[PDB]
Amino acid sequence: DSCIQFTRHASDVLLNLNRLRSRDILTDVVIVVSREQFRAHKTVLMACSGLFYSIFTDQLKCNLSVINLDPEINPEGFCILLDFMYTSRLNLREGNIMAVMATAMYLQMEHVVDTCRKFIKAS
Amino acid sequence: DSCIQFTRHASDVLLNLNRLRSRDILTDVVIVVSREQFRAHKTVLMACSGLFYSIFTDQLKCNLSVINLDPEINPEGFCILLDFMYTSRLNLREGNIMAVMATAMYLQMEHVVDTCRKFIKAS
């Protein structure tokens, strides 16, 4: 085509979606991880995770307001990944890298799994 | 913070949101422009437009499944802007620039209004 493109558009969209999340605006699901609850937008979860994409394209699960993750999933690992989904920023540290990689493998977030593998190989 | 960042994340998120729109997955509103109907995600509309942000933060309008735009709005101008919201690409042409600028002013899409003003000033 003969389109023009606005370089910062995608980043600005994601910043506004995170502002809606922080104010709890139009969130349509709660993700339960052990005792912890995380509110989010189904569309953002699907756009970032192969697991959520599979869950919310399912004709029965698409209508659920509550999703319980496997009890092996660490709430801190999930929180770091949910923050990444809405910001592109990953808080990867020596003390959380194993929990983050295991959660990213479960959520099917291929690019996060790749950087965790590389950082572990370096150490 | 000490975060790392994935450069292509925001663009990849927007690409997946457009894939959901094209397959009509989790769309929660229909925008009526004259006789034409456009299905979309409320969160994406709010993230891109000052007008939709105002509409869907309103305690009564947030629950509407149908929104009718002002009869002066051109369906082609709206279609081009909805495509921009989901892709960052604007199909700006000599034959549509006046309808696109008027629709962007109504939708309160400041960056689109700015490029339309600049392209009109050049001609």
Partner: peptide
């Protein structure tokens, strides 16, 4: 704005 750029030419993509």
């Amino acid at each position: 704005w750029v030419i993509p």
